[PDB]
Amino acid sequence: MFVPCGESAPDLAGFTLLMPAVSVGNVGQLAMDLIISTLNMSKIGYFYTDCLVPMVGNNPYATTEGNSTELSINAEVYSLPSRKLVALQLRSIFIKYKSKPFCEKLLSWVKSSGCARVIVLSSSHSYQRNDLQLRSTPFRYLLTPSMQKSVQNKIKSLNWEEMEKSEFCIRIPGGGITKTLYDESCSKEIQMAVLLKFVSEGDNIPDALGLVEYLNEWLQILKPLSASRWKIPSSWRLLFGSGLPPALF
Amino acid sequence: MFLTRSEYDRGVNTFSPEGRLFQVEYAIEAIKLGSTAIGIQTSEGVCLAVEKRITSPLMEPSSIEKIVEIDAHIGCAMSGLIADAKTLIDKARVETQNHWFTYNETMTVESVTQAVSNLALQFGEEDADPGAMSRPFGVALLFGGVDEKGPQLFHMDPSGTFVQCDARAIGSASEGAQSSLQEVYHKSMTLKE
Amino acid sequence: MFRNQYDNDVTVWSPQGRIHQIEYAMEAVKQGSATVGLKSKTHAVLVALKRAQSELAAHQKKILHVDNHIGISIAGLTADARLLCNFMRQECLDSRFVFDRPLPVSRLVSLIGSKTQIPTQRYGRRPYGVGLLIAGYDDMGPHIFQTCPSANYFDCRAMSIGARSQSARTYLERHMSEFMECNLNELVKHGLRALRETLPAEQDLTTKNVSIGIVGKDLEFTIYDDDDVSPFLEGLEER
Amino acid sequence: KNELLPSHPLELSEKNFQLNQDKMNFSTLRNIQGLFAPLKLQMEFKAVQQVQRLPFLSSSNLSLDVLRGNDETIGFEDILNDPSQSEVMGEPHLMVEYKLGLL
Amino acid sequence: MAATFFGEVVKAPCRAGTEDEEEEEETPEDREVRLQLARKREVRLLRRQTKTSLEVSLLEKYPCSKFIIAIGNNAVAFLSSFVMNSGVWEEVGCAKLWNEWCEAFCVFYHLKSNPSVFLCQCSCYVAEDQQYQWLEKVFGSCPRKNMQITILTCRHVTDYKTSESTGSLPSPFLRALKTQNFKDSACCPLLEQPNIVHDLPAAVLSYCQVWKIPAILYLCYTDVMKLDLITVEAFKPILSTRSLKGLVKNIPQSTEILKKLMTTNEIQSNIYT
Amino acid sequence: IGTGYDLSASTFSPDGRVFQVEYAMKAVENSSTAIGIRCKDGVVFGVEKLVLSKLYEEGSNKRLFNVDRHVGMAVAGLLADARSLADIAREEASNFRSNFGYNIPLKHLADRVAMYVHAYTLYSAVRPFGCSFMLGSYSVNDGAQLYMIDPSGVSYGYWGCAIGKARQAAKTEIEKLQMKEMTCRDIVKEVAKIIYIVHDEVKDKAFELELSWVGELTNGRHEIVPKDIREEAEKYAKESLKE
Amino acid sequence: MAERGYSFSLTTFSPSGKLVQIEYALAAVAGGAPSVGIKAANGVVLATEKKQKSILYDERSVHKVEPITKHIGLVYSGMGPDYRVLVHRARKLAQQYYLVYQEPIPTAQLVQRVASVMQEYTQSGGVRPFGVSLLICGWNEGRPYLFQSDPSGAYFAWKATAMGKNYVNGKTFLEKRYNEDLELEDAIHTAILTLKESFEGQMTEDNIEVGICNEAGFRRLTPTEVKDYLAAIA
Amino acid sequence: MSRGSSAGFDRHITIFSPEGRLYQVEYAFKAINQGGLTSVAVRGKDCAVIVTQKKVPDKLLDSSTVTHLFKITENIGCVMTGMTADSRSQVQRARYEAANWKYKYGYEIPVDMLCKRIADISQVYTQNAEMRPLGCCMILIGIDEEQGPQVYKCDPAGYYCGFKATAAGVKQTESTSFLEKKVKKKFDWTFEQTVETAITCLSTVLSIDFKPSEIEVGVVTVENPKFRILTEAEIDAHLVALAER
Amino acid sequence: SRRYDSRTTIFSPEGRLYQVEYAMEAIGHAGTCLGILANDGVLLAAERRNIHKLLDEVFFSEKIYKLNEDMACSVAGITSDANVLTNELRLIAQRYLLQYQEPIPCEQLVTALCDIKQAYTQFGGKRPFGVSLLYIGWDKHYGFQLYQSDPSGNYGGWKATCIGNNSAAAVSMLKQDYKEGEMTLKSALALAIKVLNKTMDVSKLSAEKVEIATLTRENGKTVIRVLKQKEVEQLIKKHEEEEAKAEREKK
Incomplete structure (x- = not known):
């Protein structure tokens, strides 16, 4: 389920897993790309699996010339030992009846590695939103019962808004795999946190910036509150593609 | 870096990034779902041959009509959706009779095919209040007839383009039948051959 | 990536301020076969590279009659092309019925522009994915007009549209001065050379795949095919 | 057919009274206001009429009346004969197909 | 996104494909038909010669040192024109699959002189859920990490993303994408950063990268795709380099004539003349 | 940012x-700059018409339209929408002459066309026009009048304005130009100078300058600048750019 | 059971068989200004509260209680403009009935016609139901009448009811207070008390609007008469 | 709608919220605020005055054409706040309706009836799906034959109420509070008194002292029922009077 | 399913119109409406549903609706849709009378209304009529008849059927206690009272929770009258006495 880049097979005991749960508009993927680019996180392995559709291309974070010519895949995992953060990066879409196998594989991998506090950066639909949620902040958080109490008190001090679950079924209209991820994580009894935001489809870079700031409010991996806050990947060029034909204008 | 579920296959009036209209191509696929019809154009006449797919012996073989008479000198072989074929055949017959009434002469096979094609391109472009062809026709026709120019064989496609063909095959086995035809067909072949 | 929402419809403006359906219609017309249209000081010639679906199937015609002095070169969607040709024929007939004079080419092109603009603004309609090279003769002389799937039209001395038309356009731009002042046969040969430049090096022009339409001062629009284009092909230089 | 020829000279005028009134209003706006007002009102009328009951059921056309300024005006048209009390109603599907332009 | 009538409530499609899963998330009949579809879609790797189903993977059965894979009509046409006539290539195995979207076949060849060198002419399309099954059937689970894989495919200029417009771009241009282990010269400009490949070539290249197999992917972007001679002409630089240098003999003359044969026998677009 | 509110023209964003x-305004901004300066004698237009290819005949895709005997039209943004709106304005002016017997005032025509554009922006069935244009005319009673219409549907008179890529640079040049005291000849020379200044030869390979004016010297009749005066203006612009 | 797609559409039935948009319109009604209608033996009173945001409001400019004809009046809770449109339609229908039959339209028939209009608007897909419920009063055949037309088009004949905010409490208060043989000029006091229960602050002549209907006909009470009634009841 | 009804509660005009609110109307109000200006109208016992801030953005822009004070008929004038194009469309519709009323009924339309018609059209907009509410606000003034001066403000939702002192724009709440304070203190409310009240209210809420060119004032008095636009010199004189006292 | 249930015209993969089923569920949410056919005559016994003390009953039929002289009907579903459907029924009956100068047969009117409902269910953009109607009438061809209509547009002639709340239990009870051929008007009323008493579990019937209308033929004229509250009270008392006697006999 997890193949290291070489033969190192890094251990992730006591680390913190980060993933971009496939959101409405890949807001989680954009936020994870921002985090990886800002923290200069190197790929330690590949999360090769049948569930994610295949893709290839040059690494999003070209930076130098040598690093520019490195080939990336659909699911590459980056890690840096300084902050004890391991960041998985899904770069593709899911296949039908393939979310549950991926969730099971990821939960097994994180349990075996030893990492705790799986951060699930996701997003929900902004139109399947209640009036109270409409007038309130779009950001929501979800905590598993097994999650350590100290961080729960930290977030309570931060005064965040818990995701409204309705009897008490916790349904995320736009999470994608987030709901079943939460269910299976609760079944497996491992610490995990879900960070979502009510978004729509379109230009979602502001949504990704808001999500990374929301994550910062808890993790505090960067300064509290600016210019070049989060470094954007070099591959975020041409969000639309091609150019303007000359005949029209 | 992230894949997208960009879809352009649903709208008939939607262009793909390469300019392809996917609904027309799916109509072509519907043609590919039909039975094989073979039409050969020679100097001694035209030959339209199609296969009857008889699901059960109880069904009358004569009821499965796929080669019809547009006019005394025009015939048509269909392949694809049967009812669309029926509508197109009715249009062709009405057009031929109108031409005879107006000009007191037989309508050219090319003219009949052109009229049927003009009917077979009104998907989101008829601009007429009456209910038009919302979806492209799902049948391909082989208008094989003999006129003053001699034997003729025209192939009509769901897109609405009619092209004169010396020997054409349309249906499930269209490609193999076409290969066999081009392997065997020669200009100076007889009708019996 | 972020343009999926604005890509589906023609009435939806993209954040960059560009409708993608029109550009996709332009891609559709590009995907069609190649035509070359050039005019001298007295003649306008349209040479087209006809394509055959199969060896047995006859080459599909790409030069269509419009009036005694106007003709078009087909490129792109065939159904939209036929609709436009019918509209232009009706307009020319109406002009000759009311004013009893040939319809000027520019007026017809303006009418086509308005007609093809109408759908791009309304819902439930798609742009005409057909490009036309219109050759005609008026009191002003020969005319070559390029019509794009976008309603805007262009007035040209020589133009090529379709697949692999960049080489033809380069060749035309190389010898524009020669085009302006040359004999009719020389102009037809220039158009044929441009069409050949469109073709691959291995391939060559044949009577089956070449269609020529010529309109001049005393010459009405006549379409030459096969044995009729053989005289023009004869004498052409080796690539 | 002879039905095309009006039986009464006033019949043709009052049969299309609403259509003629709308045409006159459009002509006046277009003379004075410009092309925008008639086009705007035409789209508005089309939008309101597009949503209503099916042909075999009598519609209220409240929004259409408000837009046309007849919400507070009563003429012989409204009182003399009631579209609700038609006394003649065709097949539902037939009427729907007729409105759709199929027949 | 229906808009069938006036008041129809339309929903914006999600580029991530979430809505499909949301609708998806049983009845025994539904499960039965779903399994029927699953076994209808799965790739069945077998050989028409002797009709012996290939349960064992191709890589396990024969040891390969150079696997050239061509996806798309133009790529297989180029291979058929250049490599077949150079030597002898007999059919060994053929993957059979059924997709919603579609001479569609996936045939594998191996050189009699050097059996270690193999080939694959995948003229058919493979759905997003079947590339991994195809990799399982062909490569198996245990790779060799000693294989020179040259993946050949043709794409459209519209797919390529750059500041210049699609029309302004020189249509017959090709790019390359190689794995970390593949240290040989790419002979082609590397793909631009925002550009992505999401088809069978991408699956094979990702498989090679994950398992440390030296491989290179070539993408020939072209405006036309139906048996075009310019596409194979632009592919020629690939054989001009190593790997395919020895497989193709010094007889371009026959290949040039052979390449014309494939282009002459082509089907034009009825819709677009 | 209206992520889920930018699909229809009948939908309001939360901020309104x-x-x-x-x-549509951005689409207008995508186009080359078209400027027009109003002076005491009349109104002079000028457009940086980029030539896409040398094959095109001189005058193709003209951006200056004569919607009436006395009214000019310099357009920007999408060309097709520009032609459509020019036709609409022509119908309006024709109708005014036919009904009231005298030439339509510039302000009234501008109001009519602007309201047409706004009506198009109102509904969801149609899309807002992607073009912006300048209506300019001169009359003995009305005087020199210049108006600009935005895809939103506004109609504001100007002493000088620009629409297109380099809108702000041209606007600054016109601001530092004292149009109210110069004649039509000096105004056309300065219009050519400004067009040449704002043109970016790097991004845009080449362009052809189209100049038209309406004023007392033309007897209140819109017309293209004569070739001699246009060449003189281009020469003056070249000299100004060189220094 | 989110049922979001079912709630978005009007013509779409919920799996349980509930029209959610109609319920949302009813919620809009419940969020409107309270209005109380009491059918006494001598007559029927329609009392509502017109919450004026600021003192710079012209009381004569608009009226929550409007006459339909010489003997029928109505009050509303919910959206104002919808109420005005429905008032215009009701007046037109009443005048059409008078022209056709040369008789004042009975209250029941007017209520049925208005309810038919509401049903027509709540049936077709493309528009929204009228987010307003009308308390219609009248006097026909020497008998008072009180009706309530819901957004869905279901009309019920009440002896005493309240709508708008705190309508459940108002209905309970009316149940405690309303009497079978109660007469006018006392049902007015009962309605004023119900408004007091549903009012936040002090009720002045301009903060509420009271309209009565009796044998003479429908009549909106002048501010002076409202002030005298308020003084009498407190 | 031809394109199709939107999904979310706040994404379409017709469909209701769980409370039953229509978010598109509220967003139209937000658009009115987005207009960027503030308009103040004051009703006296002798005249009605409308004052709005005039902001000519660019010097090249002709200040004469920049105006939000439009006359519907010879005796009724209005000040529009919000989108310029929508305000112009509403002005044209009001002019047409007033002319039609004069033609059909033989006497000039009252202000209240004009706003009633406008609000009915606005309600029609808010009920159907194809159209959208106009993002602008109409404040009508005029002298009635019997009721004297009348001030009516006329909103997208379809509310046509009349006011003794109307405010609209970005600073609507603060202007309303100031006008309520002034009304609570009942002065004589003469013509110049009403003009001073409007101008000082606008200056207080905008925290700026206007020069003659920063505001446009339109007045209509009982003695002179014709809608009159105050000349810049008269506005300057009023401002000087305000400064002196 | 969350799909194939949006446009009222999407066929499910198994060939199901879920919107019609949801309309039938809405019918099930409505109050109990019962109709029994007897040789002497046919009757309709329907639950009044609304019982609020402040509610007033100014009409003679809270939910019963007389279509013409020879016909009557009862409603269980959406009230406003029911009102429009009853208006259409009256219009169609009067149109038939005008054209043929004879009372419309019951089946013809039921078929016309069902055609209207099926048309509404066939064309997209129109909400199906969520009303189920029970018809009682007499004609010269088949005499007394009882008909039941559905939102889908399907009718059927029944001898004893119930629609609305607890329809299945009422149907089972009718099947248990119906004697085809020997059922009289009085025994039919007793059976209806028993079925209503058992179905409505709130409490014993008080003659204000139910509404009974009987259709009979007297002197060649169809008589449609609504039983007075006192008569319903007497019937309830008789049913209670019968139940008490049966319980005492059981011991």
Whole structure:
């Protein structure tokens, strides 16, 4: 389920897993790309699996010339030992009846590695939103019962808004795999946190910036509150593609 | 870096990034779902041959009509959706009779095919209040007839383009039948051959 | 990536301020076969590279009659092309019925522009994915007009549209001065050379795949095919 | 057919009274206001009429009346004969197909 | 996104494909038909010669040192024109699959002189859920990490993303994408950063990268795709380099004539003349 | 940012912005600069018409339209929408002459066309026009009048304005130009100078300058600048750019 | 059971068989200004509260209680403009009935016609139901009448009811207070008390609007008469 | 709608919220605020005055054409706040309706009836799906034959109420509070008194002292029922009077 | 399913119109409406549903609706849709009378209304009529008849059927206690009272929770009258006495 880049097979005991749960508009993927680019996180392995559709291309974070010519895949995992953060990066879409196998594989991998506090950066639909949620902040958080109490008190001090679950079924209209991820994580009894935001489809870079700031409010991996806050990947060029034909204008 | 579920296959009036209209191509696929019809154009006449797919012996073989008479000198072989074929055949017959009434002469096979094609391109472009062809026709026709120019064989496609063909095959086995035809067909072949 | 929402419809403006359906219609017309249209000081010639679906199937015609002095070169969607040709024929007939004079080419092109603009603004309609090279003769002389799937039209001395038309356009731009002042046969040969430049090096022009339409001062629009284009092909230089 | 020829000279005028009134209003706006007002009102009328009951059921056309300024005006048209009390109603599907332009 | 009538409530499609899963998330009949579809879609790797189903993977059965894979009509046409006539290539195995979207076949060849060198002419399309099954059937689970894989495919200029417009771009241009282990010269400009490949070539290249197999992917972007001679002409630089240098003999003359044969026998677009 | 509110022209964003109109404005901004300066004698137009290919005949895709004997029209943004709106304005002016017997005032025509554009932006069935244009005319009673219409549907008179890529630079040049005291000849020379200054030869390979004016010297009749005066203006612009 | 797609559409039935948009319109009604209608033996009173945001409001400019004809009046809770449109339609229908039959339209028939209009608007897909419920009063055949037309088009004949905010409490208060043989000029006091229960602050002549209907006909009470009634009841 | 009804509760005009609110009307109000200006109208016992801030953005822009004070008929004038194009469309519709009323009924339309018609059209807009509410606000003034001066403000939702002192724009709440304070203190409310009240209210809420060119004032008095636009010199004189006292 | 249930015209993969089923569920949410056919005559016994003390009953039929002289009907579903459907029924009956100068047969009117409902269910953009109607009438061809209509547009002639709340239990009870051929008007009323008493579990019937209308033929004229509250009270008392006697006999 997890193949290291070489033969190192890094251990992730006591680390913190980060993933971009496939959101409405890949807001989680954009936020994870921002985090990886800002923290200069190197790929330690590949999360090769049948569930994610295949893709290839040059690494999003070209930076130098040598690093520019490195080939990336659909699911590459980056890690840096300084902050004890391991960041998985899904770069593709899911296949039908393939979310549950991926969730099971990821939960097994994180349990075996030893990492705790799986951060699930996701997003929900902004139109399947209640009036109270409409007038309130779009950001929501979800905590598993097994999650350590100290961080729960930290977030309570931060005064965040818990995701409204309705009897008490916790349904995320736009999470994608987030709901079943939460269910299976609760079944497996491992610490995990879900960070979502009510978004729509379109230009979602502001949504990704808001999500990374929301994550910062808890993790505090960067300064509290600016210019070049989060470094954007070099591959975020041409969000639309091609150019303007000359005949029209 | 992230894949997208960009879809352009649903709208008939939607262009793909390469300019392809996917609904027309799916109509072509519907043609590919039909039975094989073979039409050969020679100097001694035209030959339209199609296969009857008889699901059960109880069904009358004569009821499965796929080669019809547009006019005394025009015939048509269909392949694809049967009812669309029926509508197109009715249009062709009405057009031929109108031409005879107006000009007191037989309508050219090319003219009949052109009229049927003009009917077979009104998907989101008829601009007429009456209910038009919302979806492209799902049948391909082989208008094989003999006129003053001699034997003729025209192939009509769901897109609405009619092209004169010396020997054409349309249906499930269209490609193999076409290969066999081009392997065997020669200009100076007889009708019996 | 972020343009999926604005890509589906023609009435939806993209954040960059560009409708993608029109550009996709332009891609559709590009995907069609190649035509070359050039005019001298007295003649306008349209040479087209006809394509055959199969060896047995006859080459599909790409030069269509419009009036005694106007003709078009087909490129792109065939159904939209036929609709436009019918509209232009009706307009020319109406002009000759009311004013009893040939319809000027520019007026017809303006009418086509308005007609093809109408759908791009309304819902439930798609742009005409057909490009036309219109050759005609008026009191002003020969005319070559390029019509794009976008309603805007262009007035040209020589133009090529379709697949692999960049080489033809380069060749035309190389010898524009020669085009302006040359004999009719020389102009037809220039158009044929441009069409050949469109073709691959291995391939060559044949009577089956070449269609020529010529309109001049005393010459009405006549379409030459096969044995009729053989005289023009004869004498052409080796690539 | 002879039905095309009006039986009464006033019949043709009052049969299309609403259509003629709308045409006159459009002509006046277009003379004075410009092309925008008639086009705007035409789209508005089309939008309101597009949503209503099916042909075999009598519609209220409240929004259409408000837009046309007849919400507070009563003429012989409204009182003399009631579209609700038609006394003649065709097949539902037939009427729907007729409105759709199929027949 | 229906808009069938006036008041129809339309929903914006999600580029991530979430809505499909949301609708998806049983009845025994539904499960039965779903399994029927699953076994209808799965790739069945077998050989028409002797009709012996290939349960064992191709890589396990024969040891390969150079696997050239061509996806798309133009790529297989180029291979058929250049490599077949150079030597002898007999059919060994053929993957059979059924997709919603579609001479569609996936045939594998191996050189009699050097059996270690193999080939694959995948003229058919493979759905997003079947590339991994195809990799399982062909490569198996245990790779060799000693294989020179040259993946050949043709794409459209519209797919390529750059500041210049699609029309302004020189249509017959090709790019390359190689794995970390593949240290040989790419002979082609590397793909631009925002550009992505999401088809069978991408699956094979990702498989090679994950398992440390030296491989290179070539993408020939072209405006036309139906048996075009310019596409194979632009592919020629690939054989001009190593790997395919020895497989193709010094007889371009026959290949040039052979390449014309494939282009002459082509089907034009009825819709677009 | 109206992520889920920018698909239809009949949908309001939470902050109250119709993003389709703004996207139409951006589409207008995508086009080359077209400037027009109003002076005491009349109004002079000028457009940086980029030539896409040398094959095109001189005058193709003209950006200056004569919607009436006395009214000019310099357009920007999408060309097709520009032609459509020019036809609409022509019908309006024709209708005014036919009904009231005298030439339509510039302000009234501008109001009519602007309201047409706004009506198009109102509904969801149609999309807002992607073009912006300048209506200019001169009359003995009305005097020199210049108007500009935005895809939103506004109609504001100007002493000088620009629409297109380098809108702000041309606007600054016109601001530092004292149009109210110069004649039509000096105004056309300065218009050519400004067009040459704002043109970016790097991004845009080449362009052809189209100049038209309406004023007392033309007897209140819109017409293209004569070739001699146009060449003189181009020479003056070249000299100014060189220094 | 989110049922979001079912709630978005009007013509779409919920799996349980509930029209969610109609319920949302009813919620809009419940969020409107309270209005109380009491059918006494001598007559029927329609009392409502017109919450004026600021003192710079012209009381004569608009009226929550409007006459339909010489003997029928109505009050509303919910959206104002919808109420005005429905008032215009009701007046037109009443005048059409008078022209056709040369008789004042009975209250029941007017209520049925208005309810038919509401049903027509709540049936077709493309528009929204009228987010307003009308308390219609009248006097026909020497008998008072009180009706309530819901957004869905279901009309019920009440002896005493309240709508708008705190309508459940108002109905309970009316149940405690309303009497079978109660007469006018006392049902007015009962309605004023119900408004007091549903009012936040002090009720002045301009903060409420009271309209009565009796044998003479429908009549909106002048501010002076409202002030005298308020003084009498407190 | 031809394109199709939107999904979310706040994404379409017709469909209701769980409370039953229509978010598109509220967004139209937000658009009115987005207009960027503030308009103040004051009703006296002798005249009605409308004052709005005039902001000519660019010097090249002709200040004469920049105006939000439009006359519907010879005796009724209005000040529009919000989108310029929508305000112009509403002005044209009001002019047409007033002319039609004069033609059909033989006497000039009252202000209240004009706003009633406008609000009915606005309600029609808010009920159907194809159209959208106009993002602008109409404040009508005029002298009635019997009721004297009348001030009516006329909103997208379809509310046509009349006011003794109307405010609209970005600073609507603060202007309303100031006008309520002034009304609570009942002065004589003469013509110049009403003009001073409007101008000082606008200056207080905008925290700026206007020069003659920063505001446009339109007045209509009982003695002179014709809608009159105050000349810049008269506005300057009023400002000087305010400064002196 | 969350799909194939949006446009009222999407066929499910198994060939199901879920919107019609949801309309039938809405019918099930409505109050109990019962109709029994007897040789002497046919009757309709329907639950009044609304019982609020402040509610007033100014009409003679809370939910019963007389279509013409020879016909009557009862409603269980959406009230406003029911009102429009009853208006259409009256219009169609009067149109038939005008054209043929004879009372419309019951089946013809039921078929016309069902055609209207099926048309509404066939064309997209129109909400199906969520009303189920029970018809009682007499004609010269088949005499007394009882008909039941559905939102889908399907009718059927029944001898004893119930629609609305607890329809299945009422149907089972009718099947248990119906004697085809020997059922009289009085025994039919007793059976209806028993079925209503058992179905409505709130409490014993008080003659204000139910509404009974009987259709009979007297002197060649169809008589449609609504039983007075006192008569319903007497019937309830008789049913209670019968139940008490049966319980005492059981011991």
